[PDB]
Amino acid sequence: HHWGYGKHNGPEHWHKDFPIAKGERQSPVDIDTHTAKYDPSLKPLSVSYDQATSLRILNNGHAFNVEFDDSQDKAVLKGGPLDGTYRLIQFHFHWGSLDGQGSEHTVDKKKYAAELHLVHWNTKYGDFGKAVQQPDGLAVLGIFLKVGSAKPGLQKVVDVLDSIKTKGKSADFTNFDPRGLLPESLDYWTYPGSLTTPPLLECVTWIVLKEPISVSSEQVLKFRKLNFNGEGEPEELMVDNWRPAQPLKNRQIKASFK
Numbered sequence: 417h418h419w420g421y422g423k424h425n426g427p428e429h430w431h432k433d434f435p436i437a438k439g440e441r442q443s444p445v446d447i448d449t450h451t452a453k454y455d456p457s458l459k460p461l462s463v464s465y466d467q468a469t470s471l472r473i474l475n476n477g478h479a480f481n482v483e484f485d486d487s488q489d490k491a492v493l494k495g496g497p498l499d500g501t502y503r504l505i506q507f508h509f510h511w512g513s514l515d516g517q518g519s520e521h522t523v524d525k526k527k528y529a530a531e532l533h534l535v536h537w538n539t540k541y542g543d544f545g546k547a548v549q550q551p552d553g554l555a556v557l558g559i560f561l562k563v564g565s566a567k568p569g570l571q572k573v574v575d576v577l578d579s580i581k582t583k584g585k586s587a588d589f590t591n592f593d594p595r596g597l598l599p600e601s602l603d604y605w606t607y608p609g610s611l612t613t614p615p616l617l618e619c620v621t622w623i624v625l626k627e628p629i630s631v632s633s634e635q636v637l638k639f640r641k642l643n644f645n646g647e648g649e650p651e652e653l654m655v656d657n658w659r660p661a662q663p664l665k666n667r668q669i670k671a672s673f674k
């Protein structure tokens with residue numbers, strides 16, 4: 417009876433196995449745009465993905481991950497609110513059963529159809545596993561998805577999903593360029609938070625872009641054909657794999673823009 421997104425193992429149950437679920441810096445949150453403070457000391461975000469080396473795509477039973485070779489100084493996030501250099505290890509999405517829900521962060525209570533998370537670890541800690549044990553271990557770049565025009569740079573991901581329908585399937589996915597998933601603007605909100613899935617570790621500097629990307633209805637429909645269950649188990653569609661907004665408690669959200 418492990419954690420998931422259902423009635424009996426979903427977000428409201430996670431605190432039993434992972435008591436940090438009720439902690440002081442949990443994610444996601446609602447971003448109250450009028451209460452976020454513009455911080456003119458915040459630097460432009462530096463996203464340097466020119467040499468990113470995607471290796472593989474994995475259905476892990478909760479989402480799918482596009483994984484990267486993080487053994488060298490390639491695909492890194494710097495600047496913005498960050499001190500030092502953070503290296504890209506994986507990305508994944510959270511999405512809904514319907515276009516009206518699916519994002520984890522919300523903006524003035526608005527839910528987007530999905531949310532992309534580009535996960536990076538602080539190079540001062542040597543690798544991902546050590547970084548997650550530190551309060552400044554990770555930087556997650558979050559990007560909202562709305563349904564409209566297709567995102568051409570997403571299509572390579574969409575097309576491989578048929579080969580990883582089920583928990584534990586992976587496929588070679590070399591040469592995927594995550595620059596094709598980025599909106600025009602790198603204007604952002606930032607706050608200190610957590611992983612949004614168990615173990616819910618409070619190790620993340622969140623950087624949430626203001627500008628959503630548009631994906632087509634057909635693209636997101638293909639996300640919804642994935643399965644939470646393993647092969648030869650009863651079919652439970654992989655939909656609504658998002659954690660709701662958590663209490664802000666004693667945190668300030670900062671805006672890079674006026």
Ligand SMILES: CN(CC(=O)Nc1ccc(S(N)(=O)=O)cc1)c1ccccc1
Nearest residue numbers: 533535548556610611612613614615617
């Ligand atoms: C399962 N896992 C690997 C992992 O990448 N976790 C993870 C990475 C990112 C996120 S999210 N949704 O906040 O961007 C959530 C979880 C893990 C991490 C730390 C300790 C133990 C397991």
Ligand SMILES: [Zn+2]
Nearest residue numbers: 509510533612
């Ligand atoms: Zn995520």
